[PDB]
Design a binder for this molecule. Structure first.
Ligand SMILES: O=C(O)[C@H]1O[C@H](OP(=O)(O)OP(=O)(O)OC[C@H]2O[C@@H](n3ccc(=O)[nH]c3=O)[C@H](O)[C@@H]2O)[C@H](O)[C@@H](O)[C@@H]1O
Ligand SMILES: O=C(O)[C@H]1O[C@H](OP(=O)(O)OP(=O)(O)OC[C@H]2O[C@@H](n3ccc(=O)[nH]c3=O)[C@H](O)[C@@H]2O)[C@H](O)[C@@H](O)[C@@H]1O
Ligand SMILES: O=C(O)[C@H]1O[C@H](OP(=O)(O)OP(=O)(O)OC[C@H]2O[C@@H](n3ccc(=O)[nH]c3=O)[C@H](O)[C@@H]2O)[C@H](O)[C@@H](O)[C@@H]1O
Ligand SMILES: O=C(O)[C@H]1O[C@H](OP(=O)(O)OP(=O)(O)OC[C@H]2O[C@@H](n3ccc(=O)[nH]c3=O)[C@H](O)[C@@H]2O)[C@H](O)[C@@H](O)[C@@H]1O
Ligand SMILES: O=C(O)[C@H]1O[C@H](OP(=O)(O)OP(=O)(O)OC[C@H]2O[C@@H](n3ccc(=O)[nH]c3=O)[C@H](O)[C@@H]2O)[C@H](O)[C@@H](O)[C@@H]1O
Ligand SMILES: O=C(O)[C@H]1O[C@H](OP(=O)(O)OP(=O)(O)OC[C@H]2O[C@@H](n3ccc(=O)[nH]c3=O)[C@H](O)[C@@H]2O)[C@H](O)[C@@H](O)[C@@H]1O
Lengths: 431, 425, 427, 420
C-alpha cells in the first residue's frame, strides 16, 4: 500500500487525507489544533462539505484514517508526506509562508529515512527552494545524512464540491525535479485515475505558478463578466443571453461566466493579491489582474446601491432580509463573502437586518454577534422586510412561494445578486 | 429561398457563397466595381482557401451571382444580409456609415415585406438606427410596407472562414418578431445549435466574445512576462491551466500580441460604448494596454541582447500578416517591430508567403522583400519569427546558421525548441 | 410548485428529494407503510451518497412529506410524477394502478408525468386509464400526460439529477411544455438543456440510451477478449479510440460484464419489442450474448490457471454489488462467479463494504462473510476483484501475500498493476 | 527532416503534402508513372493548391522509385492500400517493405500508416530483414505504427487538426524521431500491436454506432417513435456523444466495410468470434435494401417500367468514391425489376459510369434528374440538395414521391418516406 501523512485540516488537507484513506492507503492527518483533532477523531464536529463527515467516519472506523497533533510522530511512519497547511495573506499582501516553513522544519527534525515531501499548499513560485533548504538545515543541525525528494502538487478542488473534485479531477498537476518523485507520484495516482492517466508532470516552479495562474484566470472570467453585466444594464441587453452567446464558443467554454455580486472566499482574493505582489517583487506590474481586483471590489457594493437607488437614497433604518451568507453555496465559510460587504453598509445606515443561511448562521453569529437578527428559515427571514437580497444561491431559495413572500414582506422588492429568478414583485438583478 | 448579401469581405463573401452551396439563390453585392468585376471573371478579391472554387461551381450552377446595385437585388430577395465593414472611426467608435448606407438603399428599393439581417459587427442598439433609416426612405416614397430587422453576428476567422461557417460552434440570432424567427429558422435548419435572443443581446454577444478572447491573450501575456522573471515555463503553465474544463485549452497562447481588423477595433468600440454610457470597462482597458506594450517586446529583446547597440544591423523577419493564413496586416505586431527597427537604422529583410504585396503597399522601399525564408536570413544578425506560418515550423538550423551573420532567433510565437533562442515566457 | 411523486425506488426517492431541496413542496407516495414511516422518521439505511441527509433536512424543513395514499396528494399537486416499478414483457400493473388512483382523486387540471421506464406507447394507456375514472365519476376535467424518463445511475444519483447532461421531455401540449419549463428552468442555471419531443420518442429514448451504453460495453469486451489472443493492450486501445471525439472516453471499460437491473432489462425490452413487431434487434441480441459469456470469464481464467483442478480450493471475492456505491446485486457478475464456484465445490469467502446483508439474503450459508478485505483472503488460492470499490484500490500486497495460500489475483475491472503475485485480467 | 511517403491515395498524398507544408523535405512515391507525371504537373478540398505551392517551393517532389528515395530519407512512411477471403490484402504493404530493404544504406525508421492487421509489424520487419540478409549487409532499423484517421474529402483538416495522433513504437529511437516530427505541428504512444488494434477498433466502433442506430430507426417506424428525436435524446448523454449517430441507408466506402471484415477475420484466425461486429455487418448489408423495399412496398410490388431519379451516388458527400456505396445496391435492384433510372451526383458521375455504363441515364443537375420520375431517392446528402424548390419538383416529376435515405427533408403535395 502506501503510508501517507497529511499536514493540515483545512479543506485541502482534510479532503485529501480522507480520500487517500478511502482509496486504501494508511493515512495520518496532523494539525496543531488539538481540540479539532480530537473532534475529528470523535465525529463531534459539524461538517458541511457534502459527503465528508461520513467518509471520515468510515475510514476512521476501518483504521485507515487517524488524526494526530505531532508531525514528529507521523514522519517516520510515512512514505509520502503532503504539506497542506494554510497560506493566508500576509500584512503586505504577499503569501504568508510561516505555516508551510514550520511544517518543513518539523519534517526535517523528525526524518528517519527517505521520504517524499509534496507541497499541496498554494505557494509562490520558488517556494520549493525555501522548503528544501529548511528541511536540509534541520538534517544538518542533527548531523544526519538522509535522502529525500520534494515535489509540488497544487490542489484545484472548490469548497462545496471537494470530494468529487478530488476523486475525479480534470487533471492533476505535479512539479518534480527527480525520477524518483515522478515514479512514486505516478504509482500513487495511477490507481485513482481509471478514465485516463491525466497527471501533467512539469518542473517545480511551473507547477507552483500553474496554481496562481488558474485561480487568477477564474477570477478574471468573473470580473470580465461583471463589467459586461454592468454595461448590459445601461444599454438594454440581457447578460444571461450574452453569457449563453459567448460560453457557446468552445474557445471560451460555458463554466465560471456567471456575473453577480462578486466573488468571495479566501482563495481568489488572496491568491490574486499574492501573484500581484510576486510580480511587484520582480519589477513587473500585472495590469489585467489589478483591474480584475478593482472590478470585484466595486461589484460587492452593487446590492446596497440597487436598494438605495430604488428608494432614492431614503433607506436609513429600514428592515431588510438577506437569503445567503456563505461566500458560495455548500459551506459555512464566510471569508471575503459579498454578504458581509452588504451587511456592513446596511449597518452603517442603521438598518434592521434579518438573515438566513441553511448552514452558515453560527459562523455569522461568530462574526456579527447581536448586530443582525437570525431567523429560522427563508420565510421567517422576510417577515416585515422592505427588500429581500438573494446573495448566495443555495438550492432551497430557488423556487419561492411569491404569494407567501408578498404577504410576509412590508414591500415586495427582491434584489437578486445571483440572477436565478424570473418572476411569474419588483425584481432588480445584475445585468 | 432567395437571399441577398451586401459586402464582399470574408464575412459577406463566405456567407453568400456557403448559402448558395446549400441550395439558396444568392445575389452578392458591393460598391467596388473592380472587385465585383474580378468575381465575375472568377478571381476572388480576398485570400480565402477553398473559396474561389466554391464560388466557381455555384456561379456555374446558377445559384450565385454578383452585382453592384442593392436596388436591383432587393425586389428578388426574401432575406437581405448587411455584411459590410464597420472599421474603427476617427475617435475609436465603430464607423457605421457603410451599414446605414446599405440600410438606406434597401429602403429606397423595397417593394414588399423583406427581412433585413445585420451580420456586420455593430454597437448595441444599432438595430434601432437601421430600422429608422429604412423607415425614413419608405416614408419619403410614401409607401406602406412592413419589414423586420434581425441581428445574426458572424464568428468567422479570416483564412478559415468556410469551415467556421459550415461547422459553427453555434449560430446567434437576435429577433423581435415571430415572422423573422420563422424565416431565419427555415434558412438555417437545412444546415444544422441555434441561440435565439433579443436584438440588443445578439449585438452585445459579438463584442463580448471578441473581448473575452482578447482578454485571454493579454492575461496569458502578463503571465508569460512574469514567468520570464521567476523561472517558470509558460508552455507548462498553459498546459496546467487549460486542462481545467472551466478554462479550456484553446486561445491561451502568449506571444508578441494580437492584431488584425477585429480584436483591436471591437475592444476599442466596446470601451467607447461604455464611456458613452458613463461606465469604465476596467478589465478591457487593461487588456488593451497590455497588448500595446506586448507589441514592443520583440524589439526590446533584440536591443537588450545587443546591449542597446543596434544601428546599421541587418535583421530578418519571418511573418508579416497579423496571423497565419491571411494577407491582412491591420494592427499587425510586425509593423510595430519594423517601425522601431527602422527608427534605429536597422537593415530589414522580410519574408511572408502571402502578405508581401500588402507589406509593399504599406512600407514601399523601406524594407527588403525576399523570395523565401532562407533567402530572408542571408546576412542577418537576428531572425524574428513573428507569424507562425506552417512552412516556418521545421527550419534547417545548419542552413540558417551558415547563411546568417549571427545565430540569433527571437521567437514571438513560442514554436521553436533548439543558436541563441529568445522567446516569450 | 406543489409536486407529488409516486414511488420510493431510486428514481422516485431521488426526484422527490431533489425537488424539495430546490424549494418545491413535495409529497412522495408508496404503498409500503413500513418503509414510508422510516423515510419520514429518517430510520432506513441509505447507501446512495448524500441521499439520507438530504431527505432528513427536507422533511425537517417541511418541504418533503411521505404518505401512503395517492388520493390524498392529488388535489394538492400541480404536477404528479409516476415513478413506480416496471419490473421480456413489462408489468404495467403498478403504473396503471397509480394512473387509476390519480383519475379517482383528480379535482382540477393536473399534469401527469411518467418517469418510470415504460414501453413505447404507454402514455396512451395511461391517459385512457385516467379518463375511465373521470368518466365513472361523471366529472369533466382536462389534464395532460408527459414522459420524462430518468437517466441517473445508482451511486451518483443526486449529482446526476441536479446537474444532468440533459433533461428529456415528451409532451403533446403547450400547457404541459410551459409547466415543465417552469419546473426545470430554475434548476438548470448553466443553460436550459431541456429537449422537448413527442411522447413516444421520449419513451423510446430511455431504452435506446441504455441499450447504446450496453452496446459500448459488450463491444469493448469483445475487443478486450481479442486483445488477449493477439498480444495487444486493451487499456491502450481504449485510450486510442476514446480520444476520437465522435466516440468519447466514457463507458468503454471492459471487464467481467455489466449488471444491474436496468441494462439487461432494457436491452431485453427492445429485443422483445422488436419481436412483437416482426423485427429483430441483431446488434442488441449480440450485445446480450457477449455480456452473458463475459460473466463466465473470471471463473474460466481461474479454472484454466489451475488446469481445471479446482474442487476444494478456497477463494476470496472483493466486491459483490453490481457496481460500487450501492448494495444492489441485481444481475451482478459476482453471482454468476459464485454460482459456478459452488457448482465445482470451491470454498467461497466474500467481502463487500456495503452489500453483505443483501448477499446473505441471496446466498445464506453458501459463502463465508468476512469483516474486511484482508480477512477475506485468509487461506485463499485466488482473489477475484469483481466490483471496484475504492478501498480495494491500493492494497498492501505483502499482507495479502502472507495471508493467502497462493498469491493469485484475478481482476475483473482492470484496476491493478503489480509492484510475488500473478495477476490475471481482462485483455 | 527528409521524409519519404509511399502511396498516393488520400492517406499518402495528404500526409506527404501536409508534412511539406510544415517545412519538411518530402519525396512521395508511387508505382504509377502517369499519376506521378500528373502530380509533378483524387478529389480533395484544398489539396491541389497545397501540392502546387509545395512543389514550387521545392519541399515536395514525386517519384516512382522507392530505391532512390530511401537512402535520402530519415523516416519513410508506408501509406499504400490494404484492400479486402475477406482478410486484409498485405501484398502492397509487403512489396513496399521489400523495396525498402533492397534500398537501405543506413539506419532508417519505417512508419506504417496503412491500415494493417494486428501483428503486421512483425511481418514487415521480417520482409525488410530478409532483403538485408540477401544483400549480406548489417544495417539496423526501427519500425513503428502510426495509423491514419483522415476522412476522404475533409482530409487536410483531419491531418492538421487531429483529435489525437496514435503511435506504436518498440524503441526509444523511434519515439524521439516521431516526437520530433509531430511536436512542431496530443500524441498517444503505445506498443506497436496496440496501435494496429486501435485503428480497427476505432473504425469498428464507428460502424457499430451506425448499425446500432439503423436497428433503432427501423424499430421506431414500427412503434411510432421519431428516430431524429431519439438521436437527439441519446446523443445528448456525454457518455454517448452526438456525432456519428445518423441512421439512413447504410454506411459504405472502402474503409468501414473492409476493416470490419478484416477484424472479424483476424478474430476467427485466433479462434474468437466477434459477435457484436458480425451483427453490425449483417445489419448494414440489410440496410442497403431499405430504400428499394420502401419504393416497392409503396407501389404494391408493381414497379416494372417505372422511371425513378437518384440524387447522390458517392458513398458519402465530398468525394467521387463509390466503393460499397448504398446507391449501387439500390440501382442494381431497380434494374433487376426493370425500372428506368435517372441519376445525378455533382462529382461521382464518371465513377458511376465506370461501374454502370449505359444502364442508367446521367443527368445535368438535380432538376434534370427528376424529369418524369415516379420516385426520387435522396441517397447522398450533398449540400446542393438541401433546399429544393418543391413546386419545381412537383411540376417536373410524374409523381410527387420522395424517399429519403438520409433524413434531411421536412415537407413544407409530396409524399415523403424516410428511415425511422
Ligand atoms: O484555491 C482554492 O482552494 C480553490 O479556489 C476556488 O474555489 P472556491 O473559492 O472554494 O469556490 P469557487 O466555486 O471558485 O467560488 C469562488 C467565488 O466565485 C463566485 N463565482 C463563481 C463562479 C462564477 O461564475 N461567478 C461567481 O461569482 C462564487 O459564488 C464564490 O463567491 C477555485 O474554484 C478552486 O479551483 C480552487 O482550488
Ligand atoms: O479518472 C477518474 O478519476 C475516474 O475514472 C472513473 O470514472 P468515470 O470514467 O467517470 O466513470 P464513473 O462515472 O465513476 O462510473 C461509471 C461506470 O463505469 C464503471 N467503471 C468505472 C471504472 C472502471 O475502471 N471500470 C468500470 O466498469 C463503473 O462501475 C460505473 O458503473 C472511475 O470510476 C473513478 O473512480 C475515477 O474517479
Ligand atoms: O470578428 C471577427 O471577424 C473574428 O475575429 C477573430 O478572428 P481573427 O482576428 O481573424 O483571428 P484570430 O485567430 O482570433 O487571431 C487574432 C489575433 O490574436 C493572436 N492570437 C490568437 C490566439 C492566441 O492564443 N494568441 C494570440 O496571440 C493571433 O496571432 C492574431 O494576431 C475571432 O477569432 C473570430 O471568432 C471572429 O469572428
Ligand atoms: O436505467 C437506469 O436506471 C440507469 O441505468 C444505468 O445506471 P446503473 O445501472 O445504475 O449504473 P451504471 O453505472 O450504468 O452501471 C451499469 C453496469 O455497467 C458496468 N460498466 C459500466 C461502465 C463500463 O464502462 N463498463 C461496465 O462494465 C458497471 O460496472 C455496472 O455493472 C444508466 O447508466 C443510467 O443512465 C440509467 O438511468
Ligand atoms: O445547469 C445546471 O444544472 C447547474 O448549473 C450550475 O452548475 P455549474 O455551472 O456546473 O457550476 P457549479 O460547479 O455548481 O458552481 C461553480 C461556481 O459557480 C457559481 N455559480 C453557480 C451558478 C450561478 O448561477 N452563479 C454562480 O455564481 C457557484 O457559486 C460556484 O462558485 C449550478 O450552479 C448547478 O447547481 C446546476 O445543477
Ligand atoms: O479508415 C479511414 O481512412 C477512415 O474511414 C472513415 O472515413 P470515411 O469512410 O471516408 O467516411 P465517413 O464520414 O466515416 O462515412 C462512412 C460511411 O458512413 C455513413 N455514415 C456516417 C456517419 C453516420 O452517422 N451515419 C452514416 O451512415 C456515411 O454516409 C458513409 O457511407 C472514418 O470516419 C475515418 O475516421 C477513417 O480514418
Amino acid at each position: 500500500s502506501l503510508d501517507i501523512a497529511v499536514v493540515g485540516i483545512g479543506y485541502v488537507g482534510l479532503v485529501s487525507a480522507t480520500c487517500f484513506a478511502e482509496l486504501g492507503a494508511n493515512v495520518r492527518c496532523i494539525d496543531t489544533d488539538r481540540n479539532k483533532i480530537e473532534q475529528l477523531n470523535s465525529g463531534t464536529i459539524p461538517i458541511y462539505e457534502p459527503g465528508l463527515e461520513k467518509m471520515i467516519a468510515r475510514n476512521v472506523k476501518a483504521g485507515r484514517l487517524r488524526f494526530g497533533t505531532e508531525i514528529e510522530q507521523a514522519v517516520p511512519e510515512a512514505d509520502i508526506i503532503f504539506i497542506a497547511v494554510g497560506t493566508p495573506a500576509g500584512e503586505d499582501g504577499s503569501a504568508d509562508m510561516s505555516y508551510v516553513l514550520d511544517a518543513a522544519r518539523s519534517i526535517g527534525r523528525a526524518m528517519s529515512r527517505y521520504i517524499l515531501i509534496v507541497t499541496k499548499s498554494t505557494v509562490p513560485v520558488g517556494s520549493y527552494r525555501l522548503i528544501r533548504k529548511a528541511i536540509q538545515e534541520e538534517l544538518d543541525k542533527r548531523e544526519v545524512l538522509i535522502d529525500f525528494d520534494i515535489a509540488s502538487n497544487p490542489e484545484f478542488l472548490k469548497e462545496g464540491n471537494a470530494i468529487d473534485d478530488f476523486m475525479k479531477p480534470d487533471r492533476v498537476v505535479v512539479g518534480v525535479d527527480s525520477d524518483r518523485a515522478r515514479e512514486l507520484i505516478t504509482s500513487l495516482y495511477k490507481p485513482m485515475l481509471l478514465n485516463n492517466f491525466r497527471v501533467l508532470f512539469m518542473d517545480i516552479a511551473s507547477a507552483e505558478m500553474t496554481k496562481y495562474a488558474a485561480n487568477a484566470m477564474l477570477a478574471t472570467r468573473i470580473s470580465f463578466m461583471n463589467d459586461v453585466a454592468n454595461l448590459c444594464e445601461r444599454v438594454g441587453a440581457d447578460v444571461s443571453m450574452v453569457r449563453l452567446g459567448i460560453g457557446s464558443d468552445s474557445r471560451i467554454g460555458s463554466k465560471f461566466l456567471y456575473p453577480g455580486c462578486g466573488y468571495g472566499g479566501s482563495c481568489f482574493p488572496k491568491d490574486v493579491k499574492a501573484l500581484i505582489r510576486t510580480a511587484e517583487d520582480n519589477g513587473y506590474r500585472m495590469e489585467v489582474l489589478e483591474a480584475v481586483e478593482r472590478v470585484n471590489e466595486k461589484q460587492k457594493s452593487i446590492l446596497f446601491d440597487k436598494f438605495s437607488t430604488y428608494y432614492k437614497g431614503n433607506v436609513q433604518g429600514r428592515c431588510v432580509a438577506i437569503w445567503g451568507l456563505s461566500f458560495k453555496p455548500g459551506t459555512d465559510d464566510m471569508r471575503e463573502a459579498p454578504s458581509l460587504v452588504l451587511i456592513e453598509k446596511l449597518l452603517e445606515v442603521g438598518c434592521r437586518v434579518r438573515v438566513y443561511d441553511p448552514v452558515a448562521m453560527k459562523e455569522a453569529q461568530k462574526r456579527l454577534g447581536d448586530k443582525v437578527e437570525y431567523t429560522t428559515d427563508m420565510y421567517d427571514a422576510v417577515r416585515g422586510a422592505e427588500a429581500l437580497f438573494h446573495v448566495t444561491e443555495w438550492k432551497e431559495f430557488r423556487m419561492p412561494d411569491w404569494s407567501a413572500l408578498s404577504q410576509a414582506m412590508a414591500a415586495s422588492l427582491v434584489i437578486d445578486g445571483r440572477n436565478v429568478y424570473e418572476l411569474p414583485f419588483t425584481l432588480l438583478n445584475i445585468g
